[PDB]
Short mmCIF file of C-alpha atoms and ligand atoms in Angstrom, two decimals:
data_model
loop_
_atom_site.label_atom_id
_atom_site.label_comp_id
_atom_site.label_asym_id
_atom_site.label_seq_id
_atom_site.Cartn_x
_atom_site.Cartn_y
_atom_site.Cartn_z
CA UNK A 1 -11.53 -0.20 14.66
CA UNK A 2 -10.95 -1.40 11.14
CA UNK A 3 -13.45 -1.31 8.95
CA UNK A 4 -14.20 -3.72 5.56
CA UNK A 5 -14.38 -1.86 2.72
CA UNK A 6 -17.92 -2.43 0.55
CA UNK A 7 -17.17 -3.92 -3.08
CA UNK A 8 -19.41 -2.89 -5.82
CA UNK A 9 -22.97 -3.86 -6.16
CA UNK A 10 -22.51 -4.19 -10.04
CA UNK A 11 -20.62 -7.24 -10.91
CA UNK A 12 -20.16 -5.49 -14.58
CA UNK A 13 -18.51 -2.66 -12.00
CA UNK A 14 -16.30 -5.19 -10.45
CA UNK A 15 -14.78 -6.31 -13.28
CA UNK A 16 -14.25 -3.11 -15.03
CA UNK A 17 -12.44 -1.77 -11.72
CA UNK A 18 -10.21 -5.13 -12.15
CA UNK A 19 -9.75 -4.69 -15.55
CA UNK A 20 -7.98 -1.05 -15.07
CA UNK A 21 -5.63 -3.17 -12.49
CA UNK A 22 -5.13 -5.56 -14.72
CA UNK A 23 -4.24 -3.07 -17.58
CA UNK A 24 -1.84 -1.20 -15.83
CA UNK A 25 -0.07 -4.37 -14.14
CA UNK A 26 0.15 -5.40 -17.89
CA UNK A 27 1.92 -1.94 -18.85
CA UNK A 28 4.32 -2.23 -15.77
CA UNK A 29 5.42 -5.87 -16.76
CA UNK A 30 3.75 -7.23 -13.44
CA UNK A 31 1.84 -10.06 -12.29
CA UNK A 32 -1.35 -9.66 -9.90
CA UNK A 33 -0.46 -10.37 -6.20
CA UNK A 34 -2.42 -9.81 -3.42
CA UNK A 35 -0.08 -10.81 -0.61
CA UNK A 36 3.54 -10.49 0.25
CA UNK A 37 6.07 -13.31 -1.39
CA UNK A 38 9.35 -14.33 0.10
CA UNK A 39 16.40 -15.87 -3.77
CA UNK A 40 15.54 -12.31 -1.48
CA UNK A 41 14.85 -12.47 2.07
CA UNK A 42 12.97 -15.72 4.10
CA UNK A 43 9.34 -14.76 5.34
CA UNK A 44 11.49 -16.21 8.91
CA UNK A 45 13.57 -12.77 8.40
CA UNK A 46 10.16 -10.65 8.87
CA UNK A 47 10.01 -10.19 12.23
CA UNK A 48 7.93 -7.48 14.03
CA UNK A 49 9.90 -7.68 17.33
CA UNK A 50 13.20 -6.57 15.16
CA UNK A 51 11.73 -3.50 14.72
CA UNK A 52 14.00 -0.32 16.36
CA UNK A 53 11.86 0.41 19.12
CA UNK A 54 8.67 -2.12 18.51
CA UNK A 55 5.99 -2.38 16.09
CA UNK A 56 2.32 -1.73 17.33
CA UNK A 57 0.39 -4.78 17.00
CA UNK A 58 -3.01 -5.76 15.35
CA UNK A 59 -5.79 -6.97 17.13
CA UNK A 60 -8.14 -9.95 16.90
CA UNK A 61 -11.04 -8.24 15.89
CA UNK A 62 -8.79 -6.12 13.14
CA UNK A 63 -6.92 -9.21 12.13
CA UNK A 64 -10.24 -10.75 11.73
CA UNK A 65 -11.15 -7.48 9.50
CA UNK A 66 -8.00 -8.22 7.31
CA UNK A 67 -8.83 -11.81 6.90
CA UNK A 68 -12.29 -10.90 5.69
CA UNK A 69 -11.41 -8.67 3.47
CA UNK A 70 -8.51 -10.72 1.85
CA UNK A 71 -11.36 -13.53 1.51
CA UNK A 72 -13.52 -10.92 -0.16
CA UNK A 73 -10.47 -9.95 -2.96
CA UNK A 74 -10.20 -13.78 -3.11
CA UNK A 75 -13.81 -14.61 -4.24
CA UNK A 76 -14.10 -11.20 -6.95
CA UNK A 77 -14.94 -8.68 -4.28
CA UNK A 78 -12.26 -5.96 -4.56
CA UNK A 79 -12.39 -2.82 -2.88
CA UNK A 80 -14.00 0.01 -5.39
CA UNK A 81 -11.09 1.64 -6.59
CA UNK A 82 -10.43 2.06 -10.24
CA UNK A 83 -6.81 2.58 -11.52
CA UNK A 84 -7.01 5.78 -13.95
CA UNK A 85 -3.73 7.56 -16.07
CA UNK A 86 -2.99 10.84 -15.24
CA UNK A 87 -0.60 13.35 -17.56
CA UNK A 88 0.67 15.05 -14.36
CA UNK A 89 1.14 11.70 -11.95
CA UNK A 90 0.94 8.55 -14.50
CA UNK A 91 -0.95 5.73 -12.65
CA UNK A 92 -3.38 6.67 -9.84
CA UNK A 93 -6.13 5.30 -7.80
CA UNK A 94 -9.73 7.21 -7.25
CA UNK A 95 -12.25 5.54 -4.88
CA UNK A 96 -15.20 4.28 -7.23
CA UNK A 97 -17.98 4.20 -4.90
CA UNK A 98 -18.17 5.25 -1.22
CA UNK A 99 -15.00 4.23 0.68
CA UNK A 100 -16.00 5.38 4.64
CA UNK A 101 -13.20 6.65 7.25
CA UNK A 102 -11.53 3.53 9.06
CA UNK A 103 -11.92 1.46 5.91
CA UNK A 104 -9.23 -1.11 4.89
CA UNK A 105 -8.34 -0.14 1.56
CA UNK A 106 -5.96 -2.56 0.44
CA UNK A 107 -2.45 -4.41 2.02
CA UNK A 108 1.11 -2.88 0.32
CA UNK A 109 2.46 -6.78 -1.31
CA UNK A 110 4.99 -7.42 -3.22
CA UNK A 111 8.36 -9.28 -3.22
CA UNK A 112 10.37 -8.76 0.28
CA UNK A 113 13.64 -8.29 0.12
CA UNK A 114 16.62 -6.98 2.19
CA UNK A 115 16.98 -3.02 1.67
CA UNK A 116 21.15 -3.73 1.32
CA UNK A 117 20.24 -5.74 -2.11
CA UNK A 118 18.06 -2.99 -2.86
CA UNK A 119 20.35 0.05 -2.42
CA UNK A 120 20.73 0.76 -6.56
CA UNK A 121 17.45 -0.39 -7.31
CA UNK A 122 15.14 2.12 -9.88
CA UNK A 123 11.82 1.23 -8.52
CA UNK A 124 9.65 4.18 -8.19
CA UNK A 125 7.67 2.04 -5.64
CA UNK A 126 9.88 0.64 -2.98
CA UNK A 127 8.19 0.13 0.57
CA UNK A 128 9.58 -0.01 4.07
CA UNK A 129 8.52 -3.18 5.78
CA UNK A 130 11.09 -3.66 9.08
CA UNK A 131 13.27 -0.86 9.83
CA UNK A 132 15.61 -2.66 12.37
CA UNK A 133 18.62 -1.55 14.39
CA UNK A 134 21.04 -3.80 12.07
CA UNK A 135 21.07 -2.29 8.55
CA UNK A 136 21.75 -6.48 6.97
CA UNK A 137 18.04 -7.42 8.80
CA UNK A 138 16.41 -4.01 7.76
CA UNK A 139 13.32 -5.59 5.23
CA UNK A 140 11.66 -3.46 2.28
CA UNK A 141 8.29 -4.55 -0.18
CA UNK A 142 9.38 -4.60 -4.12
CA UNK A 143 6.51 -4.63 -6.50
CA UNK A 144 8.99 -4.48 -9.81
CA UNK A 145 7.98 -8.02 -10.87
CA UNK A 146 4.55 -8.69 -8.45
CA UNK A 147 1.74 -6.28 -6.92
CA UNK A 148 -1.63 -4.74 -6.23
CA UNK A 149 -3.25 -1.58 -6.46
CA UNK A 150 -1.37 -0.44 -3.49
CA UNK A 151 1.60 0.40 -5.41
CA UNK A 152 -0.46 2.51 -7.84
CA UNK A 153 -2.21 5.29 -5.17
CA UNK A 154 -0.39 8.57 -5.12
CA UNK A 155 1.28 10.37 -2.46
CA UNK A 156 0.90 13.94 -1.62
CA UNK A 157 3.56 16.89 -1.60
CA UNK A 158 5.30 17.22 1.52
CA UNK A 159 7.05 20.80 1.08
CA UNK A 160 4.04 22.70 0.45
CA UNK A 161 1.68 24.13 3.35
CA UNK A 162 -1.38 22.70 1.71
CA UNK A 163 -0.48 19.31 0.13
CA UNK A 164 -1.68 17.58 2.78
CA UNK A 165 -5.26 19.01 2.60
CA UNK A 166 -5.13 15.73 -0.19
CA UNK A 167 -4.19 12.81 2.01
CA UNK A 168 -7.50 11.02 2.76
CA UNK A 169 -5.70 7.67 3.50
CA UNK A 170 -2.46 6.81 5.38
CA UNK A 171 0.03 3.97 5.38
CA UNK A 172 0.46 2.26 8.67
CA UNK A 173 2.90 -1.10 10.02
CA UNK A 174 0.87 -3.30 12.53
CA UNK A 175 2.71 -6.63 13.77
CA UNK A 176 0.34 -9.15 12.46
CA UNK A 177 1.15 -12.65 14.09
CA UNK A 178 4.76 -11.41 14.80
CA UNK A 179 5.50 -10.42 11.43
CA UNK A 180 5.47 -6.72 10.18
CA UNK A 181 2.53 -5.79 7.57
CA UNK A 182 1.77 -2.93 5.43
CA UNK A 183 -1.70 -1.20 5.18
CA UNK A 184 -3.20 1.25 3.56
CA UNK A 185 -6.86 3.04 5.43
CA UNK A 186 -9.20 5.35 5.06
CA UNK A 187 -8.41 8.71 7.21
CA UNK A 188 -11.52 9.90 6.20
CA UNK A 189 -14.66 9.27 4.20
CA UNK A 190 -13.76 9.12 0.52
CA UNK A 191 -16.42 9.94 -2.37
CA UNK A 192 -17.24 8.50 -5.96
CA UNK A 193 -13.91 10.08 -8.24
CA UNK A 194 -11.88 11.19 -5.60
CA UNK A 195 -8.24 10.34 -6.19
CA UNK A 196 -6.64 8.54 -3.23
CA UNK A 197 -3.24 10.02 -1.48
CA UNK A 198 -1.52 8.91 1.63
CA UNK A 199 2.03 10.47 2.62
CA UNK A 200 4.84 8.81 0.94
CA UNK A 201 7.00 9.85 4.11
CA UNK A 202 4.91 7.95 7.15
CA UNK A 203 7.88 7.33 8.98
CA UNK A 204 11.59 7.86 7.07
CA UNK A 205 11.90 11.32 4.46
CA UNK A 206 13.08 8.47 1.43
CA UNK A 207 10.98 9.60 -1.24
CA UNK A 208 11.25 12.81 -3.19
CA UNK A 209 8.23 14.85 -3.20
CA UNK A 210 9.09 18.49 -4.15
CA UNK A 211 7.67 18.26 -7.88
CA UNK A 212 4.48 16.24 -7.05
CA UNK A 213 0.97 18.03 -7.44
CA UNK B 1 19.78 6.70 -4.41
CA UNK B 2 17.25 4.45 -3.93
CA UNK B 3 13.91 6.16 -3.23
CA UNK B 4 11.18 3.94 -1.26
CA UNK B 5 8.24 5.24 0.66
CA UNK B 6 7.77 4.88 4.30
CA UNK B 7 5.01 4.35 6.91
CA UNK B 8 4.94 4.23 11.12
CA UNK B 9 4.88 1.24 13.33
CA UNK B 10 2.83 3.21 16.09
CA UNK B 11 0.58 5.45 17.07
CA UNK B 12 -2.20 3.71 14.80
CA UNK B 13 -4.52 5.34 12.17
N1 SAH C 1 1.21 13.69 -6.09
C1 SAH C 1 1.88 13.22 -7.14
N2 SAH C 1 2.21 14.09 -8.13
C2 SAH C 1 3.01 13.67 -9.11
N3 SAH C 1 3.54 12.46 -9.30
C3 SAH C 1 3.15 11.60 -8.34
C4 SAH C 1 2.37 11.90 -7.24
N4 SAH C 1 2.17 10.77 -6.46
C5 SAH C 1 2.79 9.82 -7.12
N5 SAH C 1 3.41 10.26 -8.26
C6 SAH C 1 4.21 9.46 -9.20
O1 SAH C 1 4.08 8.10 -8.85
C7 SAH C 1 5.35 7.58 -8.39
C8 SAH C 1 5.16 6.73 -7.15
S1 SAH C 1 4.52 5.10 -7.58
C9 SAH C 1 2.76 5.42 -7.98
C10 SAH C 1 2.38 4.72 -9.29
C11 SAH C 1 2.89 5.47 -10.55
N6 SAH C 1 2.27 6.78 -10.77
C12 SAH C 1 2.86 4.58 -11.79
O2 SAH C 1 2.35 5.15 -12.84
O3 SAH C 1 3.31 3.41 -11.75
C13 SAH C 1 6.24 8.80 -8.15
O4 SAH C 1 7.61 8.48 -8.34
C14 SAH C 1 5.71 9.79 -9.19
O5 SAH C 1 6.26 9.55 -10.48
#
């Protein structure tokens, strides 16, 4: 079962952990958005049953998780992460208070588009939404313009024997009301300072990791 | 090459 993460007791804490977001949305030219926008592809082309051999789907009592959670970022209550610079990975996200295994860290938004009008694109953040058997319905996150903290989190080496001793979150795809939805959760219970990694490389092997730390 | 990161659609958490 999902859990919801627990925001900060502090509001001074609060706003100084959405003050590093808003900071580093600032240097990256982007604008804060906290769900997933649809010019690029029609929310009508996200749809879970496209995907190449189905999409697991979220239950009530997880959906109702989500929903809580989304009304918690709504009112001020973000999850305690703080968004910190780092010489060897640039922008990163460490947990800022407790973050307990199962917990519902944040939702992967951004602008959806089509991964065919995508193919040259630079973005060092690109996400998979609907991988589907036609190539033209295949669907992909862009956070280039609009995003969240999801976009900031690093990922962890995948050619070394020991890089995934760092993941302590992982990036899942539940149908959510029969569209596909990107999620990022606790794998494991995640300390004050500790710097959050998933694997960039769930599913497809699309992202370069070799020279990551 | 474009270079976007991936997640599963089952098998859960
Ligand atoms: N484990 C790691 N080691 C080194 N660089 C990493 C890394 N995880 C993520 N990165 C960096 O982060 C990029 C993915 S997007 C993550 C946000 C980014 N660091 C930013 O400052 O906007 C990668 O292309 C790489 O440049």
């Amino acid at each position: 079962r999902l859990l919801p993460f627990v925001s900060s007791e502090d509001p001074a804490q609060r706003l100084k952990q959405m003050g590093t977001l808003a900071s580093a949305l600032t240097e990256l030219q982007m604008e804060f958005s906290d769900d997933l926008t649809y010019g690029m592809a029609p929310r009508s082309a996200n749809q879970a049953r496209f995907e190449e051999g189905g999409m697991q789907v979220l239950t009530k009592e997880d959906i109702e998780t989500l929903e809580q959670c989304r009304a918690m970022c709504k009112r001020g209550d973000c999850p305690p992460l703080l968004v910190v610079f780092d010489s060897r990975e640039g922008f990163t996200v460490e947990a800022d208070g407790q973050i307990k295994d199962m917990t519902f860290i944040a939702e992967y938004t951004g602008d959806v588009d089509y991964i065919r009008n995508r193919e040259h694109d630079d973005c060092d953040s690109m996400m998979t939404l609907l991988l589907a058997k036609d190539p033209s319905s295949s669907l992909v996150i862009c956070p280039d313009k609009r995003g969240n903290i999801a976009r900031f989190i690093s990922g962890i080496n995948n050619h070394t024997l020991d890089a995934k001793k760092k993941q302590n979150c992982k990036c899942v795809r539940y149908s959510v009301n029969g569209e596909c939805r990107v999620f990022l959760v606790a794998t494991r219970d995640i300390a004050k300072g500790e710097r959050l990694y998933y694997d960039y490389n769930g599913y497809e092997h699309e992202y370069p990791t070799q020279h990551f730390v | 090459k474009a270079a976007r990161k991936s997640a599963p659609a089952t098998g859960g958490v």
